[PDB]
Design an enzyme around this catalytic site. Structure first.
Site, PDB file in Angstrom:
ATOM      1  N   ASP A   1       4.257   7.301  10.810  1.00  5.16           N
ATOM      2  CA  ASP A   1       4.035   5.983  10.240  1.00  5.16           C
ATOM      3  C   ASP A   1       3.033   5.897   9.093  1.00  5.16           C
ATOM      4  OD1 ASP A   1       3.754   3.303   9.828  1.00  5.16           O
ATOM      5  OD2 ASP A   1       3.388   2.806  11.954  1.00  5.16           O
ATOM      6  N   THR A   2       3.546   5.871   7.864  1.00  3.42           N
ATOM      7  CA  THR A   2       2.684   5.783   6.683  1.00  3.42           C
ATOM      8  C   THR A   2       1.931   4.441   6.609  1.00  3.42           C
ATOM      9  OG1 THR A   2       4.504   4.932   5.363  1.00  3.42           O
ATOM     10  CG2 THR A   2       4.203   7.282   5.408  1.00  3.42           C
ATOM     11  N   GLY A   3       2.376   3.454   7.380  1.00  2.35           N
ATOM     12  CA  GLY A   3       1.719   2.153   7.348  1.00  2.35           C
ATOM     13  C   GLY A   3       0.597   1.998   8.371  1.00  2.35           C
TER      14      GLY A   3
END
Ligand SMILES: CC(C)CCN(C[C@@H](O)[C@@H]1Cc2ccc(cc2)OCCCC(=O)N[C@@H](CC(N)=O)C(=O)N1)S(=O)(=O)c1ccccc1
Lengths: 99, 99
Positions: free
Chosen positions: A25-27
């Site tokens: 998850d880059t967020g």
């Protein structure tokens, strides 16, 4: 590897002797793992997102293997609906976004 | 481009003729934008996050330009802590995770 985003980017990770499925998850700034009884000292904290905040336990220096790649860092344990691998550990396995 | 994750992957997008900053979020199924006026009809919807569910307004077939790349798809408007570009639009611009 190269992971496309047609489906949720779920991969196998190994933490505390156990294998689990987690989302790359880059967020997510931090790594959040579903409730598990990890040994070690921890500090309470609250993280928030859509829907509000949840209380979690912060564990430092936890070794985590992500798709055969070793990483070690802070892991937050709490009632998250899914295991989340955040930027703090993604940077360690050399993960990038490309388009 | 190739984006590393030592910093939040924030980029400028253009929606409704206006510029906004948003986070490239591979851990998000949808694209959720902070409350704003977008032209067109919308339908009430509920989406979930780390802390629970919120109510959003759903807009379909909305043109969104992400770092110069075009996408046209569903955009959800509501009380999110930050503007996020989810997998529904990231696949349209051919974004992948690499490591
Ligand atoms: C605003 C943004 C700052 C959120 C950062 N976070 C990561 C983000 O990827 C989150 C992670 C996530 C949470 C829940 C979940 C799946 C993934 O199960 C629900 C599936 C529906 C879905 O995909 N929900 C998207 C939103 C949407 N409906 O598209 C979502 O909330 N995704 S976070 O809240 O989980 C965090 C906060 C602080 C530290 C780590 C993670």
């Amino acid at each position: 590897p190269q992971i496309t985003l047609w489906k949720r980017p779920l991969v196998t990770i190994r933490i505390g002797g156990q294998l689990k499925e987690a989302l790359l998850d880059t967020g997510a700034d931090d790594t959040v793992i579903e409730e598990m009884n990890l040994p070690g000292k921890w500090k309470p904290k609250m993280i928030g997102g859509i829907g509000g905040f949840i209380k979690v336990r912060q564990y430092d220096q936890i070794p985590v293997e992500i798709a055969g790649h070793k990483a070690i860092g802070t892991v937050l344990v709490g009632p998250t609906p899914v295991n989340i691998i955040g930027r703090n550990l993604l940077t360690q396995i050399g993960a990038t976004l490309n388009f």
